[PDB]
Scaffold this active site. Sequence first.
Site, PDB file in Angstrom:
ATOM      1  N   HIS A  36      47.573  70.296  39.107  1.00 46.89           N
ATOM      2  CA  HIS A  36      48.556  71.364  38.911  1.00 46.89           C
ATOM      3  C   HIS A  36      48.599  71.740  37.434  1.00 46.89           C
ATOM      4  O   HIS A  36      49.287  72.769  37.232  1.00 46.89           O
ATOM      5  CB  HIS A  36      49.861  70.991  39.589  1.00 46.89           C
ATOM      6  CG  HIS A  36      50.676  70.005  38.816  1.00 46.89           C
ATOM      7  ND1 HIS A  36      50.807  68.657  39.095  1.00 46.89           N
ATOM      8  CD2 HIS A  36      51.484  70.301  37.721  1.00 46.89           C
ATOM      9  CE1 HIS A  36      51.674  68.121  38.224  1.00 46.89           C
ATOM     10  NE2 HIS A  36      52.065  69.089  37.386  1.00 46.89           N
ATOM     11  N   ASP A  63      46.007  66.291  43.800  1.00 50.13           N
ATOM     12  CA  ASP A  63      46.507  66.813  42.512  1.00 50.13           C
ATOM     13  C   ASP A  63      45.627  66.187  41.453  1.00 50.13           C
ATOM     14  O   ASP A  63      46.053  65.195  40.833  1.00 50.13           O
ATOM     15  CB  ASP A  63      47.970  66.457  42.404  1.00 50.13           C
ATOM     16  CG  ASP A  63      48.634  67.214  41.232  1.00 50.13           C
ATOM     17  OD1 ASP A  63      49.849  67.068  40.974  1.00 50.13           O
ATOM     18  OD2 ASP A  63      47.925  67.981  40.533  1.00 50.13           O
ATOM     19  N   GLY A 141      56.336  67.537  31.942  1.00 48.17           N
ATOM     20  CA  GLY A 141      55.417  67.436  30.777  1.00 48.17           C
ATOM     21  C   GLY A 141      54.648  66.090  30.845  1.00 48.17           C
ATOM     22  O   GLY A 141      53.575  65.983  30.212  1.00 48.17           O
ATOM     23  N   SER A 143      53.277  64.963  33.555  1.00 46.79           N
ATOM     24  CA  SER A 143      52.218  65.153  34.559  1.00 46.79           C
ATOM     25  C   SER A 143      50.828  65.096  33.899  1.00 46.79           C
ATOM     26  O   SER A 143      50.689  65.626  32.779  1.00 46.79           O
ATOM     27  CB  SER A 143      52.255  66.542  35.212  1.00 46.79           C
ATOM     28  OG  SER A 143      53.539  66.541  35.877  1.00 46.79           O
ATOM     29  N   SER A 159      51.620  62.877  38.842  1.00 50.20           N
ATOM     30  CA  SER A 159      51.718  64.062  39.673  1.00 50.20           C
ATOM     31  C   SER A 159      53.132  64.669  39.641  1.00 50.20           C
ATOM     32  O   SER A 159      53.205  65.866  39.320  1.00 50.20           O
ATOM     33  CB  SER A 159      51.374  63.795  41.144  1.00 50.20           C
ATOM     34  OG  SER A 159      51.402  65.121  41.788  1.00 50.20           O
TER      35      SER A 159
END
Length: 198
Positions: A36, A63, A141, A143, A159
């Site tokens: 993502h 992801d 942030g 992720s 994720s």
Amino acid sequence: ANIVGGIEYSINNASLCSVGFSVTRGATKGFVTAGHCGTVNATARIGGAVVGTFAARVFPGNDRAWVSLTSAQTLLPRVANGSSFVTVRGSTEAAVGAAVCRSGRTTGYQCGTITAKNVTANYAEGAVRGLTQGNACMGRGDSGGSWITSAGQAQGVASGGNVQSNGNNCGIPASQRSSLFERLQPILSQYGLSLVTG
């Protein structure tokens, strides 16, 4: 730039994500991160300089992504822990109940335990399946950042989680946190990557 798990990078001068792990692909340098975070060919910057672009990604469903870097980047087998580093030693997958930590640009280095595997997250864009759940907190942030054991076994990339209105799940008890990561193993085989270790 020195590529370390946990540091911030921007995508097309807009969103922020965290570096997962330094990897190679034959002579190509890269880092794995969350799908993502960007679309194929989006530009990644570290401290204002271009370091590479997204080579491939899958989101939603899974992801995951890897960014191919320019030759000038220095890949390191490390994950940020404040001012210190955690050395990446391999990718043995830990079992439910193992202690684990995660590193990222928003909440720094947080640790907890793995609580469940094969979890489905329903994001606005679609479901993401096969995620491992831990109770270390995280924030917007974080992720793409590293999930690793204190012993150096890299587990996956951040994720999502049940962040609250303050942007994180650090203000709620561990018992109530659900912080999910994408397993590293399937990412390395799908893209033919090798983890950088030390």
